[PDB]
Short mmCIF file of N, CA and C in Angstrom, two decimals:
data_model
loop_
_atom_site.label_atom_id
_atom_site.label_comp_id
_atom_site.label_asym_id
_atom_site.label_seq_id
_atom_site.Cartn_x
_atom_site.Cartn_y
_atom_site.Cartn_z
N UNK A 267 27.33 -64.51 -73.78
CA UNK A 267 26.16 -64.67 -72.93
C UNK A 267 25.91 -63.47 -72.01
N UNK A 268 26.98 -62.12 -72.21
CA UNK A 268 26.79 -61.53 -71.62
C UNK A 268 25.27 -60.89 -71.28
N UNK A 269 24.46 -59.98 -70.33
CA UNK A 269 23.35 -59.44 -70.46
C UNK A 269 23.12 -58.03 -71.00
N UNK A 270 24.07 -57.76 -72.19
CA UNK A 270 24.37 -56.11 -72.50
C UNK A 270 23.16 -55.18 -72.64
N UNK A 271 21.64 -55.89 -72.72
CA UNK A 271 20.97 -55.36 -72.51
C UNK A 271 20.56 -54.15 -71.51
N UNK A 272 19.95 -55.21 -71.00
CA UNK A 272 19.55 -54.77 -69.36
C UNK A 272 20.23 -53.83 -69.21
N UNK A 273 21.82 -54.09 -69.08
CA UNK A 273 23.03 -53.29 -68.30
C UNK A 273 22.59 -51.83 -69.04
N UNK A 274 22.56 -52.08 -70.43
CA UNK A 274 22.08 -50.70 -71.20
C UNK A 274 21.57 -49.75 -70.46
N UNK A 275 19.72 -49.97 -70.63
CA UNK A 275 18.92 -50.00 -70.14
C UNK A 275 18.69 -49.26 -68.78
N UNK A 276 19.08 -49.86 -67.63
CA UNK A 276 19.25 -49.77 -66.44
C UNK A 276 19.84 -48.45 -66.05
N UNK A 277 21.33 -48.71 -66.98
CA UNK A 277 22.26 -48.01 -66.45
C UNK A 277 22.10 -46.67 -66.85
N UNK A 278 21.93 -46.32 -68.40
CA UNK A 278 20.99 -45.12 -68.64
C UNK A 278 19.91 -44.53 -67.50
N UNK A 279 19.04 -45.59 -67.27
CA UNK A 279 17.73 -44.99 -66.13
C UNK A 279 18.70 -44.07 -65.16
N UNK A 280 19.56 -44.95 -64.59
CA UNK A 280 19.91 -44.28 -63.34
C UNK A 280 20.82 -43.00 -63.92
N UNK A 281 21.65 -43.29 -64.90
CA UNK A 281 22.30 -41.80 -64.66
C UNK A 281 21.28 -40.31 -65.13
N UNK A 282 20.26 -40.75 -65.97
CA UNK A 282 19.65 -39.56 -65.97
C UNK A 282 18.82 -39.43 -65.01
N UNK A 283 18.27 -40.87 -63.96
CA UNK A 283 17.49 -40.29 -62.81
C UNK A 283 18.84 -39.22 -61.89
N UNK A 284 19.59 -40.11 -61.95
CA UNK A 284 20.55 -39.21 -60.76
C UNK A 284 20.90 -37.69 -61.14
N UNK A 285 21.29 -37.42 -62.42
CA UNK A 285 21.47 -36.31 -63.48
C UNK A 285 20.64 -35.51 -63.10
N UNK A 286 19.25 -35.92 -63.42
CA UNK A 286 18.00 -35.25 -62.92
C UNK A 286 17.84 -34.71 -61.36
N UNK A 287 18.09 -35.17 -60.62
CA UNK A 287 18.16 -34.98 -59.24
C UNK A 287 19.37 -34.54 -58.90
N UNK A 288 19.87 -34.22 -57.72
CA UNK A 288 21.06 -34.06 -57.61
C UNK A 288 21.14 -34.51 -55.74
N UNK A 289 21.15 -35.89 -56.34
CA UNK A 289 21.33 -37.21 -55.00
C UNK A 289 20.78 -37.02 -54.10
N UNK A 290 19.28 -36.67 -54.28
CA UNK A 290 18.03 -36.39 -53.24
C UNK A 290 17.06 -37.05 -54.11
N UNK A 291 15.96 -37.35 -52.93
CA UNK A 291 14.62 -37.59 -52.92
C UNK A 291 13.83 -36.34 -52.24
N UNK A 292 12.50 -35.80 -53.52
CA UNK A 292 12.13 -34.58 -52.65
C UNK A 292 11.04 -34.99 -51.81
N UNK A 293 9.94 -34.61 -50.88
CA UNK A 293 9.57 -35.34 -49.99
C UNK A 293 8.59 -33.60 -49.78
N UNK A 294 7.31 -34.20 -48.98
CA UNK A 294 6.29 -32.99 -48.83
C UNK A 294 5.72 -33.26 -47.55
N UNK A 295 5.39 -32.19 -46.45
CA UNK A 295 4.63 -33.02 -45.17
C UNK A 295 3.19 -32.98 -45.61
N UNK A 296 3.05 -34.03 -44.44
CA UNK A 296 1.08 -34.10 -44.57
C UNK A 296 1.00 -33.35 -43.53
N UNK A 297 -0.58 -33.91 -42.84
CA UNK A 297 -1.03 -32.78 -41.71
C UNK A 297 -0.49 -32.83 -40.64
N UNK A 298 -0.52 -32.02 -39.65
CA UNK A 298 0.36 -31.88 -38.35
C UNK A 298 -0.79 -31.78 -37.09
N UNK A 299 -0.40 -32.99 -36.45
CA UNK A 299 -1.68 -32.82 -35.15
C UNK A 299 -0.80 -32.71 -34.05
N UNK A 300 -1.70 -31.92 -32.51
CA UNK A 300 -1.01 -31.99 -31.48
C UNK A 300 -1.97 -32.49 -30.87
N UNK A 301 -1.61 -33.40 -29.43
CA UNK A 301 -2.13 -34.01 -28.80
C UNK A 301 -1.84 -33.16 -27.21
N UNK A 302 -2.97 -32.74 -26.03
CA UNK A 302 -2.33 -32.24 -25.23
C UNK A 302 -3.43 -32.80 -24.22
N UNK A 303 -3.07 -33.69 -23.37
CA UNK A 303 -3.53 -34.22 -22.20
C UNK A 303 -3.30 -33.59 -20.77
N UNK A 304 -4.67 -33.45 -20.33
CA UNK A 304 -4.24 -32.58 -18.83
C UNK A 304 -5.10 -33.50 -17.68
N UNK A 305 -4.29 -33.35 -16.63
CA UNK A 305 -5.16 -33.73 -15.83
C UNK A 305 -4.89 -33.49 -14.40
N UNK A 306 -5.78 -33.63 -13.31
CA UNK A 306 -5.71 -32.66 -11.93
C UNK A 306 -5.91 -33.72 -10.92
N UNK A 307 -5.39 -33.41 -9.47
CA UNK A 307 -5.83 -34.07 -8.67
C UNK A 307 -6.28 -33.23 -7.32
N UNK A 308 -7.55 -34.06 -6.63
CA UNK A 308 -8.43 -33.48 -5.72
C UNK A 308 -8.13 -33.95 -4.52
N UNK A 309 -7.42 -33.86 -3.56
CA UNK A 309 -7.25 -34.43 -2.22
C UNK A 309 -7.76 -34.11 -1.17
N UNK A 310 -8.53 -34.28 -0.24
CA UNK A 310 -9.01 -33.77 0.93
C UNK A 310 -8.45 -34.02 2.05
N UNK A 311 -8.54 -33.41 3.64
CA UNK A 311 -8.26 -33.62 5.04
C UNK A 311 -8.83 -33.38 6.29
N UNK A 312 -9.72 -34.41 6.58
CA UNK A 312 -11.51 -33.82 7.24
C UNK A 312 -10.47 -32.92 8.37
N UNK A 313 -11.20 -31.81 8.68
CA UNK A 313 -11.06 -30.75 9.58
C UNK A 313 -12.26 -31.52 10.75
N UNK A 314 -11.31 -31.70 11.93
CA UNK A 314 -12.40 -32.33 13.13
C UNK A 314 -12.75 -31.05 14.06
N UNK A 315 -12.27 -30.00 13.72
CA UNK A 315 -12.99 -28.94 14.76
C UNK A 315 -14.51 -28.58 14.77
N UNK A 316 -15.13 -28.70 13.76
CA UNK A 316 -16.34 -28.45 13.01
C UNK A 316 -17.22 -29.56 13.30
N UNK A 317 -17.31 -30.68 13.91
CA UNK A 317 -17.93 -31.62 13.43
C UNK A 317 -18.47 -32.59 15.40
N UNK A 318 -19.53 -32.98 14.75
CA UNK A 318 -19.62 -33.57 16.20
C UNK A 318 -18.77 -34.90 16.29
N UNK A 319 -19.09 -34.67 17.39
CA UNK A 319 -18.09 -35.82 18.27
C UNK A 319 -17.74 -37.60 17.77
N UNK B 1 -10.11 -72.59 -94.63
CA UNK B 1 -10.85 -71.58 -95.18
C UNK B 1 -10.53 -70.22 -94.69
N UNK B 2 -11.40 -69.32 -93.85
CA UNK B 2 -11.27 -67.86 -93.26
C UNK B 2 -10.60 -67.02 -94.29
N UNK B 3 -10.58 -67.15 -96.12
CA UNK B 3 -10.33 -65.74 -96.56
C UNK B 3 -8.38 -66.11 -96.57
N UNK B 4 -8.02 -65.01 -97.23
CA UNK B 4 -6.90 -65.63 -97.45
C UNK B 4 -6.16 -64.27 -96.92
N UNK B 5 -6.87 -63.13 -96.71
CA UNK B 5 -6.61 -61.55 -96.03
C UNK B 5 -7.37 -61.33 -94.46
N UNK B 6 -6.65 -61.42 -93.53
CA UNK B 6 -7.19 -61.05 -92.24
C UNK B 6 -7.14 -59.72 -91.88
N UNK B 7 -8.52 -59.37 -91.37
CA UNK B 7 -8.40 -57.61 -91.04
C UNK B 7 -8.97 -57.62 -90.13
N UNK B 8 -7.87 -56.71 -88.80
CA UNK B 8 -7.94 -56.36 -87.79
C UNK B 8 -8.04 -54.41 -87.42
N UNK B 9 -9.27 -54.28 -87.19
CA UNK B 9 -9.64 -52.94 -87.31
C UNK B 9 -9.35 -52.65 -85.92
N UNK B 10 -8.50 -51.70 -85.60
CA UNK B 10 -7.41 -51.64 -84.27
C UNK B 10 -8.41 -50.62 -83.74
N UNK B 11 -8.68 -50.34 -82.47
CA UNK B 11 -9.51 -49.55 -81.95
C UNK B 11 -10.91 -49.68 -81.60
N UNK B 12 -11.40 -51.01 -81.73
CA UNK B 12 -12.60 -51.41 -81.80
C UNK B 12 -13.38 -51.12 -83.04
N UNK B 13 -14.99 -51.12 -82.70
CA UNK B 13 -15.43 -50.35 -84.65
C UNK B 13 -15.53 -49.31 -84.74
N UNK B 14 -14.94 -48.99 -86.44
CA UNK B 14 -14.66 -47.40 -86.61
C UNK B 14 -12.90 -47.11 -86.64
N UNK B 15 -12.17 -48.25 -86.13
CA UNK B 15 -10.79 -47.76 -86.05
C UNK B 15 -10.00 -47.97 -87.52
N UNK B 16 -8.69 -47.93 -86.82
CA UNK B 16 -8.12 -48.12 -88.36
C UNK B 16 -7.87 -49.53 -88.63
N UNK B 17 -7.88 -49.77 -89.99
CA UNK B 17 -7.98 -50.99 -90.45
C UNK B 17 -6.24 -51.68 -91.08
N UNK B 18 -5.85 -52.57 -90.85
CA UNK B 18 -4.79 -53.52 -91.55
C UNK B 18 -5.40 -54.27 -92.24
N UNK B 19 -4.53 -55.20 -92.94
CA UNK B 19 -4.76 -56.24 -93.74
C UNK B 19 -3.70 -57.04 -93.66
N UNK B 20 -3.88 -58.05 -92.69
CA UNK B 20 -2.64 -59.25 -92.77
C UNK B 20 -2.96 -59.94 -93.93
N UNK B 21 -1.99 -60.93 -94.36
CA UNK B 21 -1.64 -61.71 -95.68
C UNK B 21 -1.36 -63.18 -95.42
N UNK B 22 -2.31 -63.94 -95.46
CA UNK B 22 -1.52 -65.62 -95.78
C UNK B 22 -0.02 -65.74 -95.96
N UNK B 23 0.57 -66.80 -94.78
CA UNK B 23 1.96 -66.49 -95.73
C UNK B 23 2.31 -68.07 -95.42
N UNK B 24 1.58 -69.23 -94.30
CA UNK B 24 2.26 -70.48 -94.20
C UNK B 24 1.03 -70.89 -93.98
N UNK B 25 1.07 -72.52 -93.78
CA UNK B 25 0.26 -73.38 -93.16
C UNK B 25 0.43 -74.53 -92.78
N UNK B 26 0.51 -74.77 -91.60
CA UNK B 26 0.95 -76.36 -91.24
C UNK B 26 0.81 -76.66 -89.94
N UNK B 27 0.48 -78.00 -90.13
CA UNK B 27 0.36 -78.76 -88.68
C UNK B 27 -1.29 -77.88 -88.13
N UNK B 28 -2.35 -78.10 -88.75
CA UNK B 28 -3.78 -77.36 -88.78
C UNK B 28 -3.29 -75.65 -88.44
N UNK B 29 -2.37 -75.40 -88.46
CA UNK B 29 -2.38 -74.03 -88.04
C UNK B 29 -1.99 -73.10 -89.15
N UNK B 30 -2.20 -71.90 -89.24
CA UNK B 30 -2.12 -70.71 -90.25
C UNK B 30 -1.74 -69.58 -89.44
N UNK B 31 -0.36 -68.71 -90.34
CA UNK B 31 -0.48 -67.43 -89.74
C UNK B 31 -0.13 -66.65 -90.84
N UNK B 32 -0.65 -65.00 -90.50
CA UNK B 32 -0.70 -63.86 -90.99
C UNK B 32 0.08 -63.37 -91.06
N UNK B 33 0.76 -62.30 -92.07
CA UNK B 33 2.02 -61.64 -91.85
C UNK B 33 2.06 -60.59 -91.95
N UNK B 34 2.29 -58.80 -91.85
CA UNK B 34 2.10 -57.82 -92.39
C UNK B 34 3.64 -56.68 -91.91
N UNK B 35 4.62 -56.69 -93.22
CA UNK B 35 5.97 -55.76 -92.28
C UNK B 35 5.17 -54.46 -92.13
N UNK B 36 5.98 -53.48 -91.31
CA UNK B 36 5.92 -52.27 -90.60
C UNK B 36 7.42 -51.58 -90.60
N UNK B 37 7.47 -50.43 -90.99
CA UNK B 37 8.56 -49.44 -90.75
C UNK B 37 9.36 -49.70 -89.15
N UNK B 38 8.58 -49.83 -88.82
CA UNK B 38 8.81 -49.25 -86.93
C UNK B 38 8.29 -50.75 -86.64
N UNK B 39 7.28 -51.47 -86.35
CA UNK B 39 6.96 -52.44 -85.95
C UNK B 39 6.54 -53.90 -86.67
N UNK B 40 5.57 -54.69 -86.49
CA UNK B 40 5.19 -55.66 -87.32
C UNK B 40 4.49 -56.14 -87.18
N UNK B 41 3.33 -56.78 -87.83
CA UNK B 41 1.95 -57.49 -87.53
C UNK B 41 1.87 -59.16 -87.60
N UNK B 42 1.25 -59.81 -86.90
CA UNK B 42 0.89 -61.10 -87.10
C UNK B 42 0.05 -61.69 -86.35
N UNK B 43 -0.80 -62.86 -86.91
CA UNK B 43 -1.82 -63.50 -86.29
C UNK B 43 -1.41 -64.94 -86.99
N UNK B 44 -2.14 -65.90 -85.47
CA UNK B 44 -2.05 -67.12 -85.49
C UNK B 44 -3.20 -68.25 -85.12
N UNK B 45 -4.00 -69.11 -86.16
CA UNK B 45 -5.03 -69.82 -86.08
C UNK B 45 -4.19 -71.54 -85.52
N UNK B 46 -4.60 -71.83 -84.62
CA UNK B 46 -4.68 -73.00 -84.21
C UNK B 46 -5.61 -74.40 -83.74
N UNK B 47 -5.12 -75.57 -84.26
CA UNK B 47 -6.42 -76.49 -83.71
C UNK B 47 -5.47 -77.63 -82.96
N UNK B 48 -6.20 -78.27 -81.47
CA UNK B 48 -5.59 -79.62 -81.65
C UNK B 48 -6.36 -80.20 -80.82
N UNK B 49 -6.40 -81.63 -80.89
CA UNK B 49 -6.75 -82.87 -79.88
C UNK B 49 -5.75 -83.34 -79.04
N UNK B 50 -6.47 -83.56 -77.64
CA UNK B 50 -5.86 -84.17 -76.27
C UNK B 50 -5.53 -85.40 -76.72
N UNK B 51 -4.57 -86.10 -75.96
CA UNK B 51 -4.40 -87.95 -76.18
C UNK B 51 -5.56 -88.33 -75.32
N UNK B 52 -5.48 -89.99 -75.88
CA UNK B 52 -7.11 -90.89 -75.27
C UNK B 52 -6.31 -91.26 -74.42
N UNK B 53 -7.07 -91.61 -73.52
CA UNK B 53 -7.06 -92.35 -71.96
C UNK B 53 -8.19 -93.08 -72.07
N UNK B 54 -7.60 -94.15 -71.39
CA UNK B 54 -8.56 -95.14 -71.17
C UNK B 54 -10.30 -94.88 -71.40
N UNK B 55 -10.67 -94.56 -70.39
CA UNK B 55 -12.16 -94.13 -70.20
C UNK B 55 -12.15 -93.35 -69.53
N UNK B 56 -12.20 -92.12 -70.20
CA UNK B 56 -12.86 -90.08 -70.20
C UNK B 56 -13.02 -89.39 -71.36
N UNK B 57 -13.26 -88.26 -71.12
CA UNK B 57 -14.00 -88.06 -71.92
C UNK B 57 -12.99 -87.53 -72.81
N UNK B 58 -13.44 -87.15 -74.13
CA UNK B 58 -12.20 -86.86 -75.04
C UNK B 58 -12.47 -85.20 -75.37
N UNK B 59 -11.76 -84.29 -75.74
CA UNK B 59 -11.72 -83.57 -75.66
C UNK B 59 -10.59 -82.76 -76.97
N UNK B 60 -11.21 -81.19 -77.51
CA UNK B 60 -10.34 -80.39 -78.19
C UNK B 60 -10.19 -79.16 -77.94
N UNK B 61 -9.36 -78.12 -78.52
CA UNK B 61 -8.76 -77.25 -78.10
C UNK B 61 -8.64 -76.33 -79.46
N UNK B 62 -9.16 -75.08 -79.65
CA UNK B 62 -9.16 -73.93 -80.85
C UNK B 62 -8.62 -72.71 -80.07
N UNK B 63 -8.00 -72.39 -80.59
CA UNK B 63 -6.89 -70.71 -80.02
C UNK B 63 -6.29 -70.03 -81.26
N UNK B 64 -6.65 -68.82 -81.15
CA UNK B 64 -6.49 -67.81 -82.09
C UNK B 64 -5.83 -66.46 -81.16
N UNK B 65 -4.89 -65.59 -81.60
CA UNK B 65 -4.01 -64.84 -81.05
C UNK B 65 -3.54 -63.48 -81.91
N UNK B 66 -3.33 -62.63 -81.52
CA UNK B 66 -3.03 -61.59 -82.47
C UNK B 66 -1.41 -60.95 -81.23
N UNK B 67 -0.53 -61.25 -82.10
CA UNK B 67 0.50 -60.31 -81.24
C UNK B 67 1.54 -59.22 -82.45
N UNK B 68 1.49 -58.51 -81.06
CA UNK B 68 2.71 -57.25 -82.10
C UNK B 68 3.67 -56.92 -81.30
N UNK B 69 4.67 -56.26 -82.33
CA UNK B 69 6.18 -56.37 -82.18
C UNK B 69 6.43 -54.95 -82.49
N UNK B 70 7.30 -54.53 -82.03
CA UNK B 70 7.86 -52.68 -82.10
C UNK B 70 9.35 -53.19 -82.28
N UNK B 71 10.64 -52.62 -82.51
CA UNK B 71 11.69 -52.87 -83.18
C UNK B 71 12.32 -51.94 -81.90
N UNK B 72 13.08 -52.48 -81.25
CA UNK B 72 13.86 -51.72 -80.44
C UNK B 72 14.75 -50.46 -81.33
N UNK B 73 14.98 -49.21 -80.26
CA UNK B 73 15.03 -48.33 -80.77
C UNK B 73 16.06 -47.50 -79.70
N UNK B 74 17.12 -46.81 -79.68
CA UNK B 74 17.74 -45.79 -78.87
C UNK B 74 18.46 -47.39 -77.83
N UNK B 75 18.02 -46.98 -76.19
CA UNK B 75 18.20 -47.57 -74.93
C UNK B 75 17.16 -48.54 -75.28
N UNK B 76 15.69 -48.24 -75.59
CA UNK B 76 14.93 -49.22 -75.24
C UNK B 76 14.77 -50.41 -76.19
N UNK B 77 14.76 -52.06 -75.42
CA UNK B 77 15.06 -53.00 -76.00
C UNK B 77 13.79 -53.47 -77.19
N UNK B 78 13.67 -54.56 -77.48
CA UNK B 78 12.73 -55.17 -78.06
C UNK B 78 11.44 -55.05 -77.14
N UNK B 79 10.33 -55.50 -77.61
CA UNK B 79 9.27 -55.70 -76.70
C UNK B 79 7.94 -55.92 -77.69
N UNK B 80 7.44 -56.76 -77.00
CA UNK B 80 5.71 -57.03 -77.85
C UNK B 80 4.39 -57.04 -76.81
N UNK B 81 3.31 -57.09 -77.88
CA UNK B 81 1.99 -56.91 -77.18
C UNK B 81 1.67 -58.52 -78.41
N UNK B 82 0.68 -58.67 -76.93
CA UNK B 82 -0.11 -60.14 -77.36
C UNK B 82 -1.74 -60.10 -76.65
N UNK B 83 -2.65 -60.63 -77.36
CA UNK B 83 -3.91 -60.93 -76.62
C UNK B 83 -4.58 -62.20 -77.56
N UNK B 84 -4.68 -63.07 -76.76
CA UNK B 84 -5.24 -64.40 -77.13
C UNK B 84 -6.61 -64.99 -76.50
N UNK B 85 -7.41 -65.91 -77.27
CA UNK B 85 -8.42 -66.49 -76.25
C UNK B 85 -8.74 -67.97 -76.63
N UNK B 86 -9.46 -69.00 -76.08
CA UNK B 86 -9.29 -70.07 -76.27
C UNK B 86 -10.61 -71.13 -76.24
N UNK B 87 -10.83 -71.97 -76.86
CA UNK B 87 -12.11 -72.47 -76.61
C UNK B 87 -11.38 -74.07 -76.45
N UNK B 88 -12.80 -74.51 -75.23
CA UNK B 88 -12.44 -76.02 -75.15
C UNK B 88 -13.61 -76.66 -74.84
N UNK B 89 -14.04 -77.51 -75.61
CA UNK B 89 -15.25 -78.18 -75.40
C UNK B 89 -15.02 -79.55 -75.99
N UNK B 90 -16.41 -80.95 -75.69
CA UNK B 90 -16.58 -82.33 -75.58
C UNK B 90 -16.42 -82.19 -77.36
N UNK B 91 -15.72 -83.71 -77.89
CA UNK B 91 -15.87 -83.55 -79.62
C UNK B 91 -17.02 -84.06 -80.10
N UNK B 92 -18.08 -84.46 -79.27
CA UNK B 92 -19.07 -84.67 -80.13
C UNK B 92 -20.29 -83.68 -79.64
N UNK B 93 -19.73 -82.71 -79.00
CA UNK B 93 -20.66 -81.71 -78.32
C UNK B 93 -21.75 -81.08 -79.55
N UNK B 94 -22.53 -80.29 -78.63
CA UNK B 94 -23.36 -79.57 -79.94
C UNK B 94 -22.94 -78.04 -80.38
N UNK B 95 -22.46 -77.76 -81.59
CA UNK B 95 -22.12 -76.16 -81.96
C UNK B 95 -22.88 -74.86 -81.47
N UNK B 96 -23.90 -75.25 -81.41
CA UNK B 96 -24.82 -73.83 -81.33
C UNK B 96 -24.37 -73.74 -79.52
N UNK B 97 -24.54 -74.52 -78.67
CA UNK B 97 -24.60 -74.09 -77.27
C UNK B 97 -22.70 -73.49 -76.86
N UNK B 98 -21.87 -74.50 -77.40
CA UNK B 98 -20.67 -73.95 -77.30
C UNK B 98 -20.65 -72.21 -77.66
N UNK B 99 -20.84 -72.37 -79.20
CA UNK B 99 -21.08 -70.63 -79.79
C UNK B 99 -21.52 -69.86 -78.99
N UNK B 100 -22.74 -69.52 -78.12
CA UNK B 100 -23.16 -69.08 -77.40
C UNK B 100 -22.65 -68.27 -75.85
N UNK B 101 -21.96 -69.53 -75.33
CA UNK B 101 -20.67 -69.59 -74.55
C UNK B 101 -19.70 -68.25 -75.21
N UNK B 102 -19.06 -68.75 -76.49
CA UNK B 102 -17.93 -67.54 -76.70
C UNK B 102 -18.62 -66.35 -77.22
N UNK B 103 -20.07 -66.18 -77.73
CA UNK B 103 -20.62 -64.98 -78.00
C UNK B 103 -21.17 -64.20 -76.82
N UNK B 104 -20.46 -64.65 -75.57
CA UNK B 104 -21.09 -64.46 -74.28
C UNK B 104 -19.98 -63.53 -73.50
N UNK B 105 -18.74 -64.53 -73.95
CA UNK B 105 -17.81 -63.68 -73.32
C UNK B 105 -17.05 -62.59 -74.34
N UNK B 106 -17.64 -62.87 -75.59
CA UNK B 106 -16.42 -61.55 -76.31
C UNK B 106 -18.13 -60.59 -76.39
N UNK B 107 -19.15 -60.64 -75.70
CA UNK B 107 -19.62 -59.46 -75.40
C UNK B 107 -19.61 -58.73 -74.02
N UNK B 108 -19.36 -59.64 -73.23
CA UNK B 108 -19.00 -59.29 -71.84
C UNK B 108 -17.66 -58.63 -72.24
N UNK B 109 -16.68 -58.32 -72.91
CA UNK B 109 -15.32 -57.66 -73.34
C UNK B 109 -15.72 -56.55 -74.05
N UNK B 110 -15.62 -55.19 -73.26
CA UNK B 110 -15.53 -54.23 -73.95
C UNK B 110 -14.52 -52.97 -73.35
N UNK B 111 -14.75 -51.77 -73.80
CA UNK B 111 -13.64 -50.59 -73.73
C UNK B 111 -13.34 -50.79 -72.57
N UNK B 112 -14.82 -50.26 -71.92
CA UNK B 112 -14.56 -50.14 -70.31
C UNK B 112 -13.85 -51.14 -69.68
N UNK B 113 -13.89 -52.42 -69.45
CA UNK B 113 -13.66 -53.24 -69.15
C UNK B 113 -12.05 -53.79 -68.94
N UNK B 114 -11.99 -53.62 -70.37
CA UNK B 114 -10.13 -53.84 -70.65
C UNK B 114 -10.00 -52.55 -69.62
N UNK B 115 -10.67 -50.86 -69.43
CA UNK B 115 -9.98 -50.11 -68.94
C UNK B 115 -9.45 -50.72 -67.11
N UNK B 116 -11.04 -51.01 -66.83
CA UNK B 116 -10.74 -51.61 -65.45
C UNK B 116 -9.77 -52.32 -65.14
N UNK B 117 -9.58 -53.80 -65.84
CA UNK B 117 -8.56 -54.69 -65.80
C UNK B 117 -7.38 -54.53 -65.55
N UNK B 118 -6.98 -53.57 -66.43
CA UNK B 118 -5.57 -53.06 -66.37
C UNK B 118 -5.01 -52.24 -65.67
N UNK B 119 -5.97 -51.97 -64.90
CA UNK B 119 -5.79 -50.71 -63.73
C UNK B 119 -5.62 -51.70 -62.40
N UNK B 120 -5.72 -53.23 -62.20
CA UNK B 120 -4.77 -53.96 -61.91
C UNK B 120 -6.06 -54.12 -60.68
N UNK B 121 -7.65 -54.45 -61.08
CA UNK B 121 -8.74 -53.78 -60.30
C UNK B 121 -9.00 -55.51 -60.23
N UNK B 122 -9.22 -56.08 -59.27
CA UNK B 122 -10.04 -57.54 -59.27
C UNK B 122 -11.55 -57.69 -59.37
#
């Protein structure tokens, strides 16, 4: 009842996938974005010499 | 009846042609036989009736099938191709409107179509 198939089968795939490769996956980048956020701050301090009373 | 040689012209029309061969018959059904070097041909005609129930309606069932077989070879195992279709209609219905029905859908079936399908497209 063994499954000598499959086992065949299978086991072939992998050693010539692995054969084929040499125990990597090759891999490619996509696009590359940068993100650059700025931002400022405005503070004031009324000057009372200038100003009426 | 249907001839005692079935020919299935592979490729739609214009392709190449077989010739299956009568080889059994029983239980209303018939099939075709044709060996192959490498693979093998066959087709299968079928008829049958539902059981009665009380009170509904009664009903039959016609299916015809063409499948093939390739002979395992090296690593790779056995494996077959099959395509079947089926008709079911009332038994005292009328022929011409049923006919119509299946001359409806094996024209709605063409190249394109099978191409879509199988490209796994809903």
């Amino acid at each position: 009842l063994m499954p000598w198939s499959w086992m065949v089968d299978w086991f072939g795939n992998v050693g010539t996938f692995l054969q084929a490769s040499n125990n990597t996956i090759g891999a490619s980048p996509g696009l590359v974005n940068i993100m650059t956020t700025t931002t400022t701050n405005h503070q004031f301090s009324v000057k009372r010499d200038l100003s009426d009373g | 009846a249907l001839g005692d040689t079935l020919t299935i012209t592979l490729g739609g029309s214009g392709g190449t042609a077989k010739v299956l061969r009568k080889i059994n018959q029983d239980g209303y059904t018939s099939e075709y036989y044709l060996p192959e070097t490498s693979s093998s041909f066959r087709a299968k005609v079928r008829h049958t009736k539902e059981s009665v129930k009380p009170n509904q309606v009664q009903y039959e069932r016609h299916n015809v099938e063409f499948t093939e077989t390739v002979y395992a070879s090296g690593s790779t195992p056995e494996f077959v191709r099959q395509a079947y279709v089926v008709i079911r209609h009332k038994v005292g219905d009328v022929s011409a409107t049923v006919s119509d029905l299946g001359e409806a859908l094996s024209f709605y079936l063409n190249e394109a179509l099978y191409g879509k399908l199988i490209g796994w497209e809903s």
